[model samples]
Target: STNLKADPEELFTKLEKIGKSFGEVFKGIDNRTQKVVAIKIIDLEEAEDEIEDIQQEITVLSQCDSPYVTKYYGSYLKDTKLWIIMEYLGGGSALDLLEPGPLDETQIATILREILKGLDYLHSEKKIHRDIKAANVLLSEHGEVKLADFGVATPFWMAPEVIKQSAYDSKADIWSLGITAIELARGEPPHSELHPMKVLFLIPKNNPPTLEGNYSKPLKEFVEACLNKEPSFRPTAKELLKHKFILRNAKKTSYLTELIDAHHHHHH
Candidate 1:
């Protein structure tokens, strides 16, 4: 890591103009290729010291090879700002889409299924995405979903007793997936209106913020399975792939078909 002052001229020369005030995103080009990229600038001096760990997290995520998840390109500290580069999805965030209205069944299914595929791969490697909300999921201009932002992810084994050794590691991620599905159905953040403390308090109780309308029973049941309080009773992503609610339309033989296509067949 290097420390230097941010110079407007140098910063501007390195990248193109940025998007409208999401305010935090910095624009840059790959010096060798000149590809337009969005760099999330982490200020080393001003922000909390914990921000330093984000680079290590980025490295871990960079090692992950999955189409269903965002590819972490790399990170560099320039002018005292740590810039994390990743696959840029031009369609904006899942949170943005969840705003206008609920997506149709096909759309929701594609996104949710892809997310589960990503989770399954990560879980198999013993990684846990501690934060898996709508905002962290991005969509391409073609409407394909890609899971992003693994700053909060930790090895499942490293999680506290509340998760590690208690089976909550995988189950907790499933619960987050249920929350993401709820956000997609609700057309907004599932529990944004509630105080953070309240949401945290409710999580242990196994009560997720309810969505309005009658969700398809199968999907609802799948979500319920994820939200089960006892981690031991919850299904891992691999198991959920075969659950009646989530996979009723398909045969059991190809339960993780998408996962196989992405990681096993072409890449691995």
Candidate 2:
């Protein structure tokens, strides 16, 4: 029950701050499992009006079962802070990992394919508003990485209709993948250097960005297919899964493991 204060420290020992977005996400050890888990600590005191909504998100996450999605371990209240538990990936955010280097197109396709499946699963579930915030929007908003912080999700990854305050749906995420593909290729979201509010103006008026430079036509087509201005034209994750760029991944998830290993070597 929300009334009974769950002894958070009893379940996990909080470690150092890993990153901060909407909340402070720490590397914590799950006391029972003794595994590294990310504890997103949000100030309950600050988010006074949002407490129940947070719990609702927690309820949504507890029921999730996809690997492409970050696993929600649990949540607890520590005095005025809300500690939301989630799985920590050594592979980290594609944006974060890119600090070491950009992923090759095949690796990019592999992860994007993984991201599509994650979206496919989320869209399949139907109740996405509550669920997307927890599972992948946290990542996808910043680049399908998971809910580290990446708040104010409307602008940087903002699709046109969303920016226009028009009715939107699952296909919005499809538009986001197009943005993300370019984001990964260019090593930052478009116009990310500008103030976020400034870009909010940019997304609605401008033509959708096209994939340029050295990427192949299929890859170019895949991005083009995603960036369609009309939401109806944007393909679903299930549809995009069979895209030639994604199909070009003869390699598997092991490619990601190899990627992180190479990333590790680069950091050293």
Question: For model 1, how does the per-residue alpha-carbon lDDT over 82-171 read when each residue is reduced to its tens digit?
Answer: 666667666666666654445655456666777788899888877877678777777665556677766343221121224333544666
* CA displacement after TM-score superposition, residue 16 of candidate 1 (Å): 6.5
Pairs with backbone N, CA or C atoms under 3 Å apart (clashes), candidate 2: 21-149, 22-149, 139-144, 139-145, 139-146, 140-144
How many residue pairs clash (N, CA or C atoms closer than 3 angstroms) in each of the candidate models, in the order given? 0, 6
lDDT for 66 in candidate 1 is: 83
Q: Using TM-score as the measure, which candidate wins?
A: 2
Q: Which runs in model 2 stand beyond 4 Å of their true positions?
A: 1-5, 129-154
List the lowest-lDDT window of 10 residues for candidate 2: 129-138
Per-residue accuracy of model 2 over 1-268 as CA lDDT, tens digit each: 2323768878789777876356787889988878888888889889887776677666666666776667876677778877788877656567655667767888778767777777788789873432122123333222334422212224777678988888888888788788888877777667768988889888888888887789878888998998889999999889999999888753566656665656566762
lDDT of 2 at 173: 79
Report every candidate's CA lDDT. Answer: 0.61, 0.70
